[PDB]
């Protein structure tokens, strides 16, 4: 959305911004910093990550760094910027960026909340669950700058129970959270295959590329190597292939001939023969793009008397079956996949808090709004309602904030 912002230069700082990039960096001219208390700050209309397309009519779309600097420095007192937020994100998350964000004020209020007698969890929850993940990182930075202590450690001491689990999860970057959840699922004598499957089967190529990098940075070992240590058989081969994050990207053309051939190959490898050609299933379901596989699974119904999910249940068992079932759901309808997992986490006696928390934290800035739509459509009551009946206290309030509201 191209928008126009008028900035009045001040003799201290000028526009009061810093810029990055240029065509020699294969980047568009991007606002990198907005200095507190300067010209562009007082407009409250520009955000870090904005692409400056023109300055008083002077086009900057194909400008180098120096070309943009000279154009920005030359412009008179009144400056009209045509900007366009080019930072990629999702419009279907429930947690949005707070519109009056002050990282120092939040850090100071969180310090006050922690030091208050009995701890003011309400304020801590009201702040952190109503800031984007990027804003939380800025709060963590300002907290360390003012108090000289790390925010995550301070909150771990102040909080306990499920509330601590939610808050500490919210403080990690998305890749950090997934990496630490993957490490947790491969800790001790046993293995949490359900949690391992949920993350590996649902994460995209871009998300997995970042997880693989951050995992090695955090634990000094490759994620694939830890997967190999804690899994075996065809389940290992499927998990290792998926975790590589090298699925084919969604192309422009629809390959109908390959859609039909994949459908026949999936049929020949399973329902048509005794046993299963598991490597063939792994190759097709890990290499093809998601839109392609959606059409493959429908074309598969033309050849097989059972659909892909029912075919998996009849062909394989154990962890391998659970992996394929989760993967196919993520391909067909990922928001419905998470809606169903949320329902299973609460429907019965007690709560599967680990799963409930992990989904509310990890999907809150991705597709929580679609999850909520699928949930309300299938179960008749909102996700908000189900969280209300299964959780209590400040833990409940934090989850309700992450939910975002009723349906």
């Amino acid at each position: 959305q191209k928008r126009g912002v008028k900035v009045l230069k001040q003799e201290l700082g000028g526009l009061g911004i810093s810029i990055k990039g240029g065509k020699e960096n294969k980047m568009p001219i991007l606002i990198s910093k907005i200095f507190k208390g300067l010209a562009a700050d007082q407009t409250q209309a520009l955000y870090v990550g904005d692409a400056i397309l023109s300055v008083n009519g002077a086009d900057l779309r194909d400008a180098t760094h120096d070309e943009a600097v000279q154009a920005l420095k030359r412009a008179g007192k009144e400056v009209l910027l045509e900007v366009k937020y080019m930072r990629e994100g999702s419009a279907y998350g429930s947690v949005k960026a707070y519109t009056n964000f002050d990282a120092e004020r939040d850090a100071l209020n969180i310090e006050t909340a922690i030091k208050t007698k009995g701890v003011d969890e309400v304020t801590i929850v009201n702040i952190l669950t109503n800031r984007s993940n990027e804003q939380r990182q800025d709060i963590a930075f300002a907290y360390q700058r003012r108090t000289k202590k790390e925010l995550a450690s301070a909150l771990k001491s102040a909080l306990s129970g499920h509330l601590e689990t939610v808050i500490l999860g919210l403080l990690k970057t998305p890749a950090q959270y997934d990496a630490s959840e993957l490490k947790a699922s491969m800790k001790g004598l046993g293995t949490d295959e359900d949690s391992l499957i949920e993350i590996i089967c649902s994460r995209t190529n871009q998300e997995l590329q970042e997880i693989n990098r951050v995992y090695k940075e955090m634990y000094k070992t490759d994620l694939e190597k830890d997967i190999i240590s804690d899994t075996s058989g065809d389940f290992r081969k499927l998990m290792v292939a998926l975790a590589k994050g090298r699925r084919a990207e969604d192309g422009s053309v629809i390959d109908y001939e390959l859609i039909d051939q994949d459908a026949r190959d999936l049929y020949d490898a399973g329902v048509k023969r005794k046993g299963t050609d598991v490597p063939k299933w792994i190759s097709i379901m890990t290499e093809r793009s998601v839109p392609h596989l959606q059409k493959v699974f429908d074309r598969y119904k033309s050849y097989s008397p059972y659909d892909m999910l029912e075919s998996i249940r009849k062909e394989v068992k154990g962890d391998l079956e659970n992996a394929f079932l989760n993967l196919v759901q993520c391909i067909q309808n990922k928001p419905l996949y998470f809606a169903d997992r949320l329902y299973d986490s609460m429907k019965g006696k007690g709560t599967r808090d680990k799963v409930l928390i992990r989904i509310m934290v990890s999907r809150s800035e991705v597709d929580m709004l679609k999850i909520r739509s699928e949930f309300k459509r299938k179960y008749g009551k909102s996700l908000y309602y189900y969280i209300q009946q299964d959780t209590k206290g400040d833990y409940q309030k934090a989850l309700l904030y992450l939910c975002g509201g009723d349906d």
Partner: peptide, 7 residues
């Protein structure tokens, strides 16, 4: 190049 320039 993480080159920044103030303007």
């Amino acid at each position: 190049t993480r080159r920044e320039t103030e303007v």
